[PDB]
Design a protein around this ligand. Structure first.
Ligand SMILES: *[C@@H]1O[C@H](CO)[C@@H](O[C@@H]2O[C@H](CO)[C@@H](O[C@@H]3O[C@H](CO[C@H]4O[C@H](CO)[C@@H](O)[C@H](O[C@H]5O[C@H](CO)[C@@H](O)[C@H](O)[C@@H]5O[C@H]5O[C@H](CO)[C@@H](O)[C@H](O)[C@@H]5O)[C@@H]4O)[C@@H](O)[C@H](O[C@H]4O[C@H](CO)[C@@H](O)[C@H](O)[C@@H]4O[C@H]4O[C@H](CO)[C@@H](O)[C@H](O)[C@@H]4O)[C@@H]3O)[C@H](O)[C@H]2NC(C)=O)[C@H](O)[C@H]1NC(C)=O
Ligand code: Y9O
Ligand code: CA
Ligand code: CA
Ligand code: NA
Ligand code: NA
Ligand code: ZN
Length: 805
């Protein structure tokens, strides 16, 4: 109940929420149906529209008007935004030459440059170029400030998950807004875009920027605008708040536009109808900048122009129906559209079986336009699994398509032409970022980056300590003129042992065999030097990775590779090797096919054994440093050490062997050498974080050899590819992957074909950031380079996307 009979007189767009059933005059009052009786009258004035005209200049103040053109309006802070242009001979902000903002030029009483986040829904990255002729204000922000060619949203590429990621720096699995629609089985409650459940605080995890600010004594304006408040009134309200006394004035503000998303759904991303919405958003930017200029704030405020996601062509003829695949379609609930989430319709149904649903959905139609996954098998870069609101069965839908349960769902609900929500690496889903103001750089292009990084930067712009989040703080320092965050590298927690030769061959009873009994002072000294690390500078190019947790491990040196060998997991945490452009690929010689060799530096008790693999009918093994890339027949024996072996399903060995035999040399050829670091990952609870020993769900049968859930590789070379990877003077280039370690290749519908037709496609799907691998391994890479630490942080956040221009 609301007692709507109090008044909004002197309270319009009050910042503090007054407590029920007392009536409200704040922004949110419309959303809750709790506004005082006179809110529309007092707070939503529209009389005489939004612009001054010549006949209005110097008018007698009429308090009924939407905005004012009277002499007193500047001191009241309520002029129409074009007042000084029409009435005082000034120029529009957009018509002014841009001039570098070297220092904040703020009025007396301003403690810090305010931050205004101007958010636009469905603003596809390519609109910045394709719409530039119709968006002069935005084009001026972009060209004169700091801009990225695009900014990568989070998955799913929907509004609430992305706006709340902007607000928190968190992945949706961590902040809890995992879709625009959700069911939480613990609350037994459903979240929808329409309705009131979505305002309940239990949905919204983490700590959003406005709360971060308020806790640290920095006042915030509204972030969520009620849909019925016109954009012109949102801008006027922000300008009015900026005219408050110092002690009352917020330092952080947001604007939001539901365009161009609203029209893009109706017309498609490039429908001719889309020009007008882009012109209108540009006009709104112009109102804000004209308004700031009138207040003498246009060289004081930092403005961020940012989108939540892009927009793709999607029409309802491009819909896959689950009723064409499942016999039992009535026993499931599907969250449909540009992603699919499946759960049992009834928890009482003991005939429900996820395995049979996945199988019925796997590679059943030649041109099938979605792929089913158990959520733990989704690409790790999506970070889309560790939340009870994410159903165990997920459908990744091809760009331009929908999935639905039955055809009747599509016509009893072919109107729309645009949608979004797809995989966040898809080009059409990318969105925009521009920063303009004293704290941003001048006329500066920065590489694409992820929206999870922005919360830290917004905290830096406001002098706030960010709450714990998924950004990598410092990775966006290159966007900023000042206020940079200068992180220190994390301290190494575990120091390595450097074992020498400590065991005789006969101490091992591993069930392994090798035809290596093939028997020189010249070259005996050489082999000893290699085992002490004489080639390490060639193979460990950026320092050894640091281990950031407590464990027991050994550094092992070899002619062709170096490794950090875990005595706890019985395999390397990492193996590092450099392959020059000139490297030759060779075969595994016949006499060495089944060769595994005890490592006389590592105790039998801390080694794998061959008998376990013989007995485990499901599990085979592979090698981290590839025997195919040995530098000589003699060095090749090192590759068959038991300390270089890792457990691999035979189906996965198809993938790994093709990567090692074909792809590494291809990349060395293309990139002028590569340095490779490879290793296992254990993430059985799919939280994106390194498992401890007691979290491991599967072992090689009868042994203590843990089975990895994934294998990673980090492939680094010189950004200037005229220099070889091992003699690089300047910035680095990286690409990485985290491949799922699966006992079948059901994910790859073409896997019956030669690996040349499917393996690299799989690897591209599972592309990763170095930072993703760091979370999953507790390792810290690139500790010893010539490069600045913030440059290295940017490198560690890079994702090689494999999308065209
Ligand atoms: C991205 O960045 C984020 C932010 O840094 C990273 O997430 C953090 O990861 C930590 C490790 O997973 C996690 O730390 C745990 O916190 C527990 C207390 O958490 C509450 O308090 C915080 C602080 O305010 C709050 O933020 C949390 O919010 C979560 O929970 C509510 C739901 O109740 C949601 O509204 C909210 O969205 C968020 O949910 C997300 O996180 C939880 C995990 O907390 C997931 O379950 C959800 O699915 C969702 O993703 C909480 O309200 C604390 O209790 C934990 O301590 C246990 O583990 C330690 C290990 O040291 C152990 O020593 C303790 O004994 C304890 O174990 C006991 O409990 C076990 C479980 O019941 C039990 O089995 C044992 O036997 C023991 O009894 C732990 O320290 C931290 O909370 C989150 N923070 C956030 C915001 O998510 C994230 O990892 C980053 N991602 C990547 C890939 O890098
Ligand atoms: C720039 C920016 C704009 C935002 O919303 C702009 C908006 N205005 N109107 C409208 O439809 N949208 C989408 C939000 C946001 C979005 C959704 C939810 C919340 C939130 O945290 N809420 C609201 C519900 O109640 C719970 C708390 C905040 C976050 C940021 Cl960073
Ligand atoms: Ca949106
Ligand atoms: Ca884990
Ligand atoms: Na086996
Ligand atoms: Na297959
Ligand atoms: Zn939309």
């Amino acid at each position: 109940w609301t007692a709507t009979s109090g008044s909004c007189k002197g309270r319009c767009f009050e910042l503090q929420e007054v407590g029920p059933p007392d009536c409200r005059c704040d922004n949110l009052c419309k959303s809750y149906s709790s506004c005082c009786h006179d809110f529309d009258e007092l707070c939503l004035k529209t009389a005489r529209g939004w612009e001054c005209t010549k006949d209005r200049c110097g008018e007698v103040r009429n308090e009924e008007n939407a905005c004012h053109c009277s002499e007193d309006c500047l001191s009241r802070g309520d002029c129409c935004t074009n007042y000084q242009v029409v009435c005082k001979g000034e120029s529009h902000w957009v018509d002014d030459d841009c001039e570098e903002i070297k220092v904040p030029e703020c009025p007396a009483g301003f403690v810090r440059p305010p931050l205004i986040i101007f958010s636009v829904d469905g603003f596809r990255a390519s609109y910045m170029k394709k719409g530039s002729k119709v968006m002069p204000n935005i084009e001026k922000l972009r060209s004169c400030g700091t801009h990225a060619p695009y900014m990568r949203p989070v998955y799913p590429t929907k509004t609430f998950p992305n706006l709340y990621t902007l607000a928190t720096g968190l992945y949706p699995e961590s902040h809890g807004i995992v879709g625009n629609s959700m069911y939480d089985p613990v609350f037994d409650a459903s979240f929808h875009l329409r309705g009131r459940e979505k305002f309940n605080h239990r949905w919204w995890g983490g700590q959003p920027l406005w709360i971060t600010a308020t806790k640290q004594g920095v006042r915030a304006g509204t972030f969520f605008w009620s849909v019925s408040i016109p954009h012109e009134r949102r801008i006027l309200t922000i300008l009015q708040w900026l005219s408050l006394p110092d002690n009352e004035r917020p330092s952080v503000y947001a604007f939001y536009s539901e365009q161009p998303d609203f029209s893009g759904h109706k017309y498609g991303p490039f429908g001719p109808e889309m020009t007008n919405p882009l012109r209108e958003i540009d006009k709104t930017v112009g109102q804000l900048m004209d308004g700031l200029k009138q207040l003498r704030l246009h060289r004081c405020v930092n403005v961020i122009f940012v989108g939540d996601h892009g927009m793709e062509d999607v029409t309802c003829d491009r819909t896959e129906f689950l009723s064409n695949y499942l016999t039992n379609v009535d026993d499931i609930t599907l969250v449909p559209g540009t992603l699919g989430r499946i759960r049992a319709k009834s928890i009482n149904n003991s005939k429900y079986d996820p395995k049979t649903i996945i199988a019925a959905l796997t590679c059943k139609k030649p041109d099938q336009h979605f792929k089913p996954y158990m959520k733990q098998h989704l690409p790790k870069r999506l970070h889309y699994a560790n939340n009870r609101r994410i159903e165990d069965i997920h459908l990744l839908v091809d760009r331009r398509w929908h999935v639905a349960r039955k055809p009747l769902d599509v016509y009893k609900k072919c109107f729309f032409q645009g949608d979004h929500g797809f995989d966040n690496k898809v080009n059409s889903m990318q969105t925009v970022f521009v920063g303009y103001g004293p704290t941003f750089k001048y006329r500066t292009k920065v590489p694409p980056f992820e929206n999870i990084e922005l919360y830290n930067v917004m905290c830096d712009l406001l002098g706030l300590k960010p709450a714990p989040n998924n950004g990598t703080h410092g990775s966006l320092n290159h966007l900023l003129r000042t206020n940079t965050f200068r992180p220190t590298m994390p301290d190494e927690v575990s120091r390595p042992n450097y074992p020498g030769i400590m065991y005789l061959q006969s101490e091992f009873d591993l069930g392994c065999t090798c035809d290596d009994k093939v028997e020189n002072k010249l070259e005996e000294l050489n082999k000893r030097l290699h085992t002490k690390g004489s080639t390490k500078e060639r193979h460990l190019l950026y320092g050894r990775p640091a281990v950031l947790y407590r464990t027991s491990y050994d550094i092992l040196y070899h002619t062709d590779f170096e490794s950090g060998y875990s005595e706890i997991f019985l395999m390397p945490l990492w193996t590092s090797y450099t392959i020059s452009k000139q490297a030759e690929v060779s075969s595994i010689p016949e006499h060495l096919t089944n060769c595994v060799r005890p490592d006389v530096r590592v105790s039998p008790g801390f080694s794998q054994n061959c008998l376990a693999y013989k007995n485990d009918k499901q599990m085979s093994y592979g090698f981290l440093f590839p025997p195919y890339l040995s530098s000589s027949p003699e060095a090749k024996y090192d590759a068959f050490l038991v300390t270089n072996m890792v457990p691999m399903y035979p189906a996965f060995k198809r993938v790994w062997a093709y990567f090692q035999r074909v792809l590494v040399k291809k990349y060395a050829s293309e990139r002028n050498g590569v340095n490779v670091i490879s290793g296992p990952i254990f993430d059985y609870n799919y939280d994106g974080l390194r498992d401890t020993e007691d979290e491991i769900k599967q072992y090689v049968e009868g042994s203590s050899i843990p089975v990895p859930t994934h294998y990673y590789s980090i492939i680094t070379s010189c950004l200037d590819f005229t220099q070889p990877a091992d003699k690089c003077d300047g910035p680095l280039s990286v690409s990485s992957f985290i491949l799922p370690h699966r006992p079948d290749n059901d994910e790859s519908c073409n896997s019956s074909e030669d690996e040349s037709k499917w393996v690299e496609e799989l690897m591209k799907m599972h592309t990763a950031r170095v930072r993703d691998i760091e979370h999953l391994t507790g390792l810290d890479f690139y500790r010893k380079t010539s490069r600045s630490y913030s440059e290295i942080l940017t490198l560690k956040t890079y994702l090689h996307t494999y999308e065209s221009e």
